[PDB]
Design a protein around this ligand. Structure first.
Ligand SMILES: Cc1cc2nc3c(=O)[nH]c(=O)nc-3n(C[C@H](O)[C@H](O)[C@H](O)COP(=O)(O)OP(=O)(O)OC[C@H]3O[C@@H](n4cnc5c(N)ncnc54)[C@H](O)[C@@H]3O)c2cc1C
Ligand SMILES: Cc1cc2nc3c(=O)[nH]c(=O)nc-3n(C[C@H](O)[C@H](O)[C@H](O)COP(=O)(O)OP(=O)(O)OC[C@H]3O[C@@H](n4cnc5c(N)ncnc54)[C@H](O)[C@@H]3O)c2cc1C
Ligand SMILES: Cc1cc2nc3c(=O)[nH]c(=O)nc-3n(C[C@H](O)[C@H](O)[C@H](O)COP(=O)(O)OP(=O)(O)OC[C@H]3O[C@@H](n4cnc5c(N)ncnc54)[C@H](O)[C@@H]3O)c2cc1C
Ligand SMILES: Cc1cc2nc3c(=O)[nH]c(=O)nc-3n(C[C@H](O)[C@H](O)[C@H](O)COP(=O)(O)OP(=O)(O)OC[C@H]3O[C@@H](n4cnc5c(N)ncnc54)[C@H](O)[C@@H]3O)c2cc1C
Ligand SMILES: O=c1[nH]c(=O)n([C@@H]2C[C@H](O)[C@@H](COP(=O)(O)O)O2)cc1F
Ligand SMILES: O=c1[nH]c(=O)n([C@H]2C[C@H](O)[C@@H](COP(=O)(O)O)O2)cc1F
Ligand SMILES: O=c1[nH]c(=O)n([C@H]2C[C@H](O)[C@@H](COP(=O)(O)O)O2)cc1F
Ligand SMILES: O=c1[nH]c(=O)n([C@H]2C[C@H](O)[C@@H](COP(=O)(O)O)O2)cc1F
Lengths: 242, 239, 246, 243
């Protein structure tokens, strides 16, 4: 069974303006918070600059002048499914995110799905080769699992027994095995992720993820992600540059 | 000298949106619900297989009891804090898993700045008088230097170049103001480290107040901290 | 078909030179001396009133007991680690206060890659065989995919990207047990936290083995800094390290 | 009234020990050699098959050109910094990828504490005198509070924490210009970012002066890693660094 990439926005900043600060703005949530924090530095509550009088104008300005630390106050979480283990091994090299990921030590993978590398998505021959090799690996897994539980059948704690079995058995599961992950980042962390991974230099699977994250973040905070331009390459893949 | 009292205002928390095609719901909203979701994502335990942990409060109690603290990182809270001293912020910002935006003495004029009275001096008219007179002397000097530095030196940077030099004389007690954002794990660590007998009483008072507001927001996440009063009437928090 | 044994090689540590004007000397050099120097800098406490903290090992043991762990961050150690699996590195790199440089399957040839045997099946020749046969089939599949993918991306002019486009796709079939190699750098505090989390009975046996070996090499380069960790051998013969301060 | 000039002393750097059975060597030691080792581990490029990057300095210049800054994190330098003000350290420690150990006003008596002169008033004696007079006045208030606080905490039988309870309140009156002292440790990537942000005309002139001195000593340790930073003197005589 193959798994399609799915990205679902599950959390974002709720902003509660403090009543005794003489300031308002034409926005809500993370974008509003980011403006509040910017202004706290200068106590510029009355907005004496006409061209930064709207939220979008203030956020646009912040980025233009490169005051990126102000962006860190607002965050967004996604639940990402239909991503491979090779892709999460790349993703989690980003150290200014927080992660909760599906565990092969704890979750049975006998019926696990696989993710097709975008490079061979339209190639039926290559896909068939991939999927049959995946079925062979899953069969080896179930075979290893039985023998391993038998082998640890002097381990009185049955729960620990199965986990000892499962963590060794998963040695044969391929990189393409689907995983699922909650990723939380602040806006600065997201911008850095998109710059790095939505590039022609990046692997195509993570590039595809970065583009989809960008599209969804652009909706929550248009002015924070505006400078990114999405273009298509010769192969129909997209990159985002700023 | 006008004195500034500590004020802590909660200005941001988490909005949670359960994703439609995952067969799970919970009784909670916001940060605590997000934390449960992220913990269950690890085990894909979307049904309520275990009764003891089939409510949000039961689930988070488990998470904390068995030390799975990384899952707490997904939810955040922001405060706007005023009536805190410059020496207090110099300690606060040593915590590197928070994000900060702070009142800038290079930009903001301090001719009328307030001072924060150290908790140890608060109850004493003599001591407070000594501080406030010293503060007034320093503000006079600040303004003197500011005038001679503007004269010593474009118009905006002239002022800023002047202002960044002039603040050399502003005391540690000078009021500052700051936005602090942290995830639940970061806040837990801050409270454990700062709401303690080992900490300065100013940052201690700050940490207790943050704990009080956080526990109102997310009581299962902060339930293991007990507030105790010491002989000197200050408060500490232990887990 | 070829198996890779765990190997941990210490490749970098801290070199310390005391500032000559500071009226202080100590019992040690490198990292442990740096850490003492940093701790004394907070207090400007250059003199030595207490027999128990008047030696480097003594001062360091004191820092750890009173929980001033931020002082330990000034000294770092790097290892080059080989004979570690991809599933092991996927756990390892969740530690975010380390720096990593790791063998890239997007670039490096994997047709002859070695496999890492899970410790749980190390002594069972039949299980080793089920595993290595599977890895051989997977490497054959990788080579079959790559041949075709190379043709598909041949018209990409940049040599480095066209090799990555083919190989990044081919490695989809490589198993978790595939050998990787990684340079890991961290400061003493970061190493302490890793050991606490990974040299434990809750941890997977492969990363546990790695943690214990790092601990042993770290305790050798940095006396007193890791002394509160005590290695014990569980009943299955695997080793765990425990500390009452971590 | 004693003034303290900036001093930056390099106290630690990376010691590199190349691993026996990896078929590679290079024309450097220390942090620069380690950085090259880590970079080559990513591709197992041990034979050095590219002649243009076959020297250490060339490989390091390549890393930076290609933007693979993560590899620079493996090597570090530590400084002991004195003659820096409290306002300067309040800025410096906003950099969260450094480690710090700093002189504590909670624990260290400040009766004899020195003043750091802002670079802005350095060539104006009358301004310096206003500063140092205000410092002396603050320091006398500090001592006055300290005695009066040590008395007021007679309750406390523990003499150590009695004097710290005193000191932590008493330092309320100490000025921003109060000298502090700090050990700062960072890897090469963190140092590059610090220099980029602080050795610029946008930064306060004290921290800018600090960043320039660090850059000069770091360039001595790892020239190729810091070569793209070029010091310029602005019209006012201060120095900026730009890449
Ligand atoms: C037995 C075991 C089982 C595990 N099971 C799972 C699992 O099922 N699913 C899963 O996704 N992961 C799992 N993990 C991974 C685990 O949740 C951590 O990600 C990993 O162990 C890294 O350690 P750390 O979280 O302490 O953070 P590190 O990255 O090692 O950080 C060190 C310290 O810095 C602090 N810190 C770092 N970053 C932040 C931050 N952003 N905010 C606040 N504080 C921070 C914390 O104090 C932390 O202890 C498991 C780990 C173990 C040991
Ligand atoms: C009572 C008290 C006295 C103090 N006295 C002094 C003093 O005399 N001098 C002085 O300089 N400071 C002093 N400090 C500051 C102290 O050293 C810490 O910098 C500060 O409290 C931040 O807490 P933390 O060290 O846990 O790091 P945080 O920045 O709060 O990080 C949280 C967690 O992330 C992890 N982490 C973060 N960065 C790293 C890293 N670079 N490497 C490895 N792990 C990391 C650690 O697990 C850490 O616990 C004092 C603090 C207290 C509470
Ligand atoms: C001219 C100037 C004026 C300033 N004015 C103000 C002011 O008025 N008010 C104020 O509060 N501050 C001010 N600052 C401080 C500034 O906003 C930063 O806090 C400080 O310079 C630290 O640098 P940094 O933001 O690059 O982060 P560092 O902590 O130096 O981290 C380095 C890099 O790590 C990454 N990073 C670290 N932490 C995170 C995180 N939590 N999330 C995502 N990425 C992270 C970023 O990529 C960053 O570039 C000013 C700084 C300068 C240079
Ligand atoms: C095209 C491509 C190819 C790659 N190839 C390889 C490879 O062959 N081998 C390999 O091992 N990795 C490889 N990587 C991973 C890469 O080295 C980084 O680990 C990963 O992209 C995370 O990004 P980041 O390093 O910018 O830092 P993040 O962890 O995303 O941190 C964000 C920012 O915080 C700051 N920061 C975080 N931690 C530190 C720190 N410890 N010191 C100083 N600053 C810090 C930096 O400013 C950084 O930009 C590759 C990545 C890409 C995009
Ligand atoms: O003991 C564990 N350690 C670990 O780091 N994780 C991880 C890292 C990975 O990102 C994810 C799933 O890992 P695994 O397949 O090893 O369970 O959570 C999981 C565990 F169970
Ligand atoms: O309790 C303390 N908390 C703290 O954060 N520091 C830090 C912050 C600052 O970077 C330096 C000196 O702090 P202080 O003058 O408050 O002691 O060490 C020191 C303490 F003693
Ligand atoms: O584009 C890349 N992105 C990435 O994060 N790495 C990392 C992640 C992993 O820790 C290791 C090897 O990754 P991979 O097999 O995907 O090349 O280096 C490597 C790349 F080439
Ligand atoms: O150039 C600056 N650099 C800096 O780090 N800050 C910080 C540090 C401090 O936490 C707060 C105010 O610093 P200052 O009073 O120097 O403006 O924001 C502010 C600037 F203007």
């Amino acid at each position: 069974e193959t798994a399609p990439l799915r990205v679902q926005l599950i959390a974002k900043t709720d902003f509660l303006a403090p009543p005794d600060v003489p300031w308002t703005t034409d926005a809500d949530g993370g974008p509003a918070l980011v403006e509040f924090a910017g202004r706290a530095c200068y106590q510029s509550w009355s907005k004496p600059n006409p061209k930064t009088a709207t939220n979008a104008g203030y956020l646009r300005h912040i980025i233009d002048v490169g005051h990126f630390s102000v962006l860190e106050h607002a965050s967004v979480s996604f639940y990402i499914t239909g991503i491979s283990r090779s892709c999460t091994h790349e993703l989690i090299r980003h150290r200014h995110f927080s992660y909760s990921q599906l565990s092969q030590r704890y979750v049975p993978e006998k019926d696990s799905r696989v993710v097709v590398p975008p490079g061979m998505e339209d190639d039926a021959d290559l896909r068939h080769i991939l999927t049959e090799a995946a079925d062979a690996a899953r069969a080896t897994y179930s075979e290893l699992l039985a023998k391993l539980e038998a082998k640890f059948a002097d381990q009185p704690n049955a729960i620990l027994r199965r986990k000892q079995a499962r963590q060794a058995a998963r040695a044969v599961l391929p990189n393409a095995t689907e995983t699922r992950i909650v990723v939380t980042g602040n806006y600065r962390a997201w911008r850095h992720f998109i710059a790095m991974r939505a590039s022609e230099h990046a692997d195509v699977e993570i590039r595809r993820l970065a583009i989809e994250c960008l599209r969804q973040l652009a909706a929550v905070a248009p002015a924070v992600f505006a400078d990114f331009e999405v273009t298509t390459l010769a192969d129909g893949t997209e990159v985002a540059t700023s």
